Scaffold this active site. Structure first.
Site, PDB file in Angstrom:
ATOM      1  N   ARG A 141      -3.962   4.864  -1.640  1.00 13.82           N
ATOM      2  CA  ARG A 141      -3.429   3.450  -1.183  1.00 13.82           C
ATOM      3  C   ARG A 141      -3.060   2.518  -2.186  1.00 13.82           C
ATOM      4  O   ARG A 141      -2.066   1.680  -1.932  1.00 13.82           O
ATOM      5  CB  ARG A 141      -4.589   2.919  -0.190  1.00 13.82           C
ATOM      6  CG  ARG A 141      -4.705   1.628   0.140  1.00 13.82           C
ATOM      7  CD  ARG A 141      -6.058   1.113   0.596  1.00 13.82           C
ATOM      8  NE  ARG A 141      -6.239  -0.149   0.984  1.00 13.82           N
ATOM      9  CZ  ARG A 141      -5.695  -0.835   2.260  1.00 13.82           C
ATOM     10  NH1 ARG A 141      -5.014  -0.244   2.995  1.00 13.82           N
ATOM     11  NH2 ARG A 141      -6.176  -2.187   2.271  1.00 13.82           N
ATOM     12  N   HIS A 150       0.716  -1.088  -0.192  1.00 12.22           N
ATOM     13  CA  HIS A 150      -0.138  -0.066  -0.025  1.00 12.22           C
ATOM     14  C   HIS A 150       0.771   1.418  -0.003  1.00 12.22           C
ATOM     15  O   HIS A 150       1.714   1.670   0.845  1.00 12.22           O
ATOM     16  CB  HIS A 150      -0.931  -0.021   1.339  1.00 12.22           C
ATOM     17  CG  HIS A 150      -1.757  -1.290   1.193  1.00 12.22           C
ATOM     18  ND1 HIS A 150      -2.204  -1.977   2.144  1.00 12.22           N
ATOM     19  CD2 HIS A 150      -2.821  -1.507   0.523  1.00 12.22           C
ATOM     20  CE1 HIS A 150      -2.939  -2.991   2.070  1.00 12.22           C
ATOM     21  NE2 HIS A 150      -3.574  -2.637   0.652  1.00 12.22           N
ATOM     22  N   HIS A 182       3.449  -3.231   6.566  1.00 16.05           N
ATOM     23  CA  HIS A 182       2.222  -2.488   6.414  1.00 16.05           C
ATOM     24  C   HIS A 182       2.330  -1.414   7.462  1.00 16.05           C
ATOM     25  O   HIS A 182       3.142  -1.493   8.677  1.00 16.05           O
ATOM     26  CB  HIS A 182       0.969  -3.486   6.542  1.00 16.05           C
ATOM     27  CG  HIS A 182       0.855  -4.291   5.209  1.00 16.05           C
ATOM     28  ND1 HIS A 182       0.099  -3.774   4.078  1.00 16.05           N
ATOM     29  CD2 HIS A 182       1.332  -5.230   4.950  1.00 16.05           C
ATOM     30  CE1 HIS A 182       0.231  -4.706   3.234  1.00 16.05           C
ATOM     31  NE2 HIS A 182       1.044  -5.533   3.509  1.00 16.05           N
ATOM     32  N   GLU A 206       1.480   3.925   3.350  1.00 19.49           N
ATOM     33  CA  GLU A 206       2.025   3.298   4.522  1.00 19.49           C
ATOM     34  C   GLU A 206       3.408   3.712   4.596  1.00 19.49           C
ATOM     35  O   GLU A 206       4.326   2.808   4.525  1.00 19.49           O
ATOM     36  CB  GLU A 206       1.677   2.136   4.730  1.00 19.49           C
ATOM     37  CG  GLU A 206      -0.016   1.745   4.777  1.00 19.49           C
ATOM     38  CD  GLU A 206      -0.297   0.363   4.575  1.00 19.49           C
ATOM     39  OE1 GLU A 206       0.267  -0.592   4.395  1.00 19.49           O
ATOM     40  OE2 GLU A 206      -1.623   0.302   4.490  1.00 19.49           O
ATOM     41  N   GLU A 235       1.793  -4.735  11.032  1.00 19.48           N
ATOM     42  CA  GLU A 235       1.218  -3.333  10.998  1.00 19.48           C
ATOM     43  C   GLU A 235       1.884  -2.619  11.973  1.00 19.48           C
ATOM     44  O   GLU A 235       1.848  -2.602  13.057  1.00 19.48           O
ATOM     45  CB  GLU A 235      -0.195  -3.622  11.165  1.00 19.48           C
ATOM     46  CG  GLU A 235      -1.129  -4.159   9.965  1.00 19.48           C
ATOM     47  CD  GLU A 235      -1.491  -3.195   9.053  1.00 19.48           C
ATOM     48  OE1 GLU A 235      -1.450  -2.007   9.335  1.00 19.48           O
ATOM     49  OE2 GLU A 235      -2.193  -3.493   8.072  1.00 19.48           O
TER      50      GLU A 235
HETATM   51  N1  LIG Z   1      -3.592  -9.779   4.593  1.00 15.40           N
HETATM   52  C1  LIG Z   1      -3.966 -10.059   5.823  1.00 15.40           C
HETATM   53  C2  LIG Z   1      -4.046  -8.715   6.542  1.00 15.40           C
HETATM   54  C3  LIG Z   1      -4.499  -7.240   5.597  1.00 15.40           C
HETATM   55  C4  LIG Z   1      -4.957  -6.252   6.504  1.00 15.40           C
HETATM   56  C5  LIG Z   1      -4.532  -4.740   5.556  1.00 15.40           C
HETATM   57  N2  LIG Z   1      -4.824  -3.534   6.776  1.00 15.40           N
HETATM   58  C6  LIG Z   1      -4.539  -2.334   6.345  1.00 15.40           C
HETATM   59  O1  LIG Z   1      -4.550  -2.002   5.063  1.00 15.40           O
HETATM   60  N3  LIG Z   1      -4.849  -1.469   7.275  1.00 15.40           N
HETATM   61  C7  LIG Z   1      -5.037   0.014   6.883  1.00 15.40           C
HETATM   62  C8  LIG Z   1      -4.490   1.066   7.965  1.00 15.40           C
HETATM   63  C9  LIG Z   1      -5.223   1.514   8.987  1.00 15.40           C
HETATM   64  C10 LIG Z   1      -6.853   2.091   8.182  1.00 15.40           C
HETATM   65  C11 LIG Z   1      -7.427   2.730   9.511  1.00 15.40           C
HETATM   66  C12 LIG Z   1      -7.862   1.944  10.728  1.00 15.40           C
HETATM   67  C13 LIG Z   1      -6.580   1.545  11.466  1.00 15.40           C
HETATM   68  C14 LIG Z   1      -5.536   0.851  10.097  1.00 15.40           C
HETATM   69  C15 LIG Z   1      -5.876   0.506   5.831  1.00 15.40           C
HETATM   70  O2  LIG Z   1      -5.722   1.643   5.298  1.00 15.40           O
HETATM   71  N4  LIG Z   1      -7.106  -0.241   5.496  1.00 15.40           N
HETATM   72  C16 LIG Z   1      -7.923   0.023   4.681  1.00 15.40           C
HETATM   73  C17 LIG Z   1      -8.973  -1.379   4.549  1.00 15.40           C
HETATM   74  C18 LIG Z   1     -10.343  -0.675   4.641  1.00 15.40           C
HETATM   75  C19 LIG Z   1     -10.528  -0.533   6.387  1.00 15.40           C
HETATM   76  C20 LIG Z   1      -9.536   0.696   6.452  1.00 15.40           C
HETATM   77  C21 LIG Z   1      -9.131   1.170   5.206  1.00 15.40           C
HETATM   78  C22 LIG Z   1     -10.199   0.707   4.246  1.00 15.40           C
HETATM   79  C23 LIG Z   1      -5.460  -4.784   4.579  1.00 15.40           C
HETATM   80  O3  LIG Z   1      -6.573  -4.010   4.735  1.00 15.40           O
HETATM   81  O4  LIG Z   1      -5.026  -5.242   3.339  1.00 15.40           O
HETATM   82 ZN   LIG Z   2      -1.158  -1.966   4.157  1.00 16.68          ZN
END
Ligand SMILES: NCCCC[C@H](NC(=O)N[C@H](CC1CCCCC1)C(=O)N[C@H]1C[C@H]2CC[C@@H]1C2)C(=O)O
Ligand SMILES: [Zn+2]
Ligand SMILES: [Zn+2]
Ligand SMILES: [Zn+2]
Length: 305
Positions: free
Chosen positions: A122, A64, A192, A67, A266
């Site tokens: 993102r 992403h 991430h 990040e 993360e």
């Molecule tokens: N593969 C297994 C793990 C995957 C988890 C991974 N997590 C991840 O991207 N999180 C971030 C970081 C922050 C966002 C704010 C709240 C706290 C964390 C993020 O931008 N997620 C986006 C996804 C939806 C929910 C929030 C937005 C839309 C992912 O979504 O791919």
């Molecule tokens: Zn990410």
């Protein structure tokens, strides 16, 4: 000028990968494993002492775009490898017995775009039929529960799964490399931000992996380790159960290829700063994170398969 204590633009990172390679030619080699949608070369760093029949650990950052601490962490780890090889017990053991494939930025077009147009981008920067909405979420693009609940079929959305699993030149390149090197790769790590969370399979459905227990005990122990520098607090678990459903993830795809140790880190923080983490937190986040990384790599070394 490149610096490990600042966020560097893509031109800075690209030049750094050419330079850290030529300056440490016995510890590092660099391939292009593909090109991005905009035709940028996706560099991969093979890090480790050249030797025959070596097992390997794959790691990626920059999946992403926004990040930024994550991209800074791949460079940091390469920094640790080069500076501490020959000087620190464990790192040293690790580079003799293992190769580290470190992909410092997967989503190179997205990253450029957070530097030039939108800090809170993102996704990728590929176009989509029928809309002027841009981008696919790479971490919903992998062929693992592809595009089920937690992934969106809407191109305008921040979790859009693509037009097909592996539709992104970037996803395809990273999955092609890993299938091409499957019998050597013993672990998969994907860096991430943010949320101070260590996740392992599964994110694409509520199910627990065959080695849940071992992954539970291993995530518990790396959180514990990480927490010993500055006392930073991380939670952990199975992805679906911990965060949310997030199918088409690279961590699940790799595990279902038979890479038994697969984790998503993360990094800092909990929300004060978010994606916009002060450059003054680079050093500490990477240092505390390195302890969790080496902790996992030392486990793997002791549990080859
Ligand atoms: N593969 C297994 C793990 C995957 C988890 C991974 N997590 C991840 O991207 N999180 C971030 C970081 C922050 C966002 C704010 C709240 C706290 C964390 C993020 O931008 N997620 C986006 C996804 C939806 C929910 C929030 C937005 C839309 C992912 O979504 O791919
Ligand atoms: Zn990410
Ligand atoms: Zn250090
Ligand atoms: Zn054991």
């Amino acid at each position: 000028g490149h610096s490990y204590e600042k966020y560097n633009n893509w031109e800075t990172i690209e030049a750094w990968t050419k330079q850290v390679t030529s300056e440490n030619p016995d510890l590092i080699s660099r391939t292009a494993i593909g090109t991005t949608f905009l035709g940028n070369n996706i560099y991969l760093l093979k890090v480790g002492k050249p030797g025959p029949n070596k097992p390997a650990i794959f790691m990626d950052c920059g999946i992403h775009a926004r990040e930024w601490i994550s991209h800074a962490f791949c460079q940091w780890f390469v920094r640790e490898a080069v500076l501490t090889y020959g000087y620190e017990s464990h790192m040293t053991e690790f580079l003799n017995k293992l190769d580290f494939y470190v992909l410092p930025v997967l989503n190179i077009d997205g990253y450029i775009y957070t530097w030039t147009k939108n800090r809170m981008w993102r996704k990728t920067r590929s176009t989509n039929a029928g809309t002027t909405c841009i981008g696919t979420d790479p971490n919903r693009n992998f062929d693992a529960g592809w595009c089920t609940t937690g992934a969106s079929t809407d191109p305008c959305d921040e979790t859009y799964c693509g037009s097909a699993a592996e539709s992104e030149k970037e996803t395809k390149a990273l999955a092609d490399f890993i299938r091409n090197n499957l019998s050597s790769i013993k672990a998969y790590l994907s860096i991430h931000s943010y949320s101070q969370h260590i996740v392992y399979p599964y994110s694409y459905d509520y199910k627990l992996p065959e080695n849940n227990a071992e992954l539970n005990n291993l995530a518990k122990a790396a959180v514990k380790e990480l927490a010993t520098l500055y006392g930073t607090k991380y939670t952990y678990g199975p992805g679906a159960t911990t965060l949310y459903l997030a199918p088409g993830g690279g961590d699940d795809w790799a595990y279902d290829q038979g890479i038994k140790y697969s984790f998503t880190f993360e990094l800092r923080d909990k929300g004060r700063y978010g994606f916009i983490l002060p450059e003054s937190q680079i050093q500490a986040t990477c240092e505390e994170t390195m302890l969790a990384i080496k902790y996992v790599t030392n486990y793997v070394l002791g549990h080859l398969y």
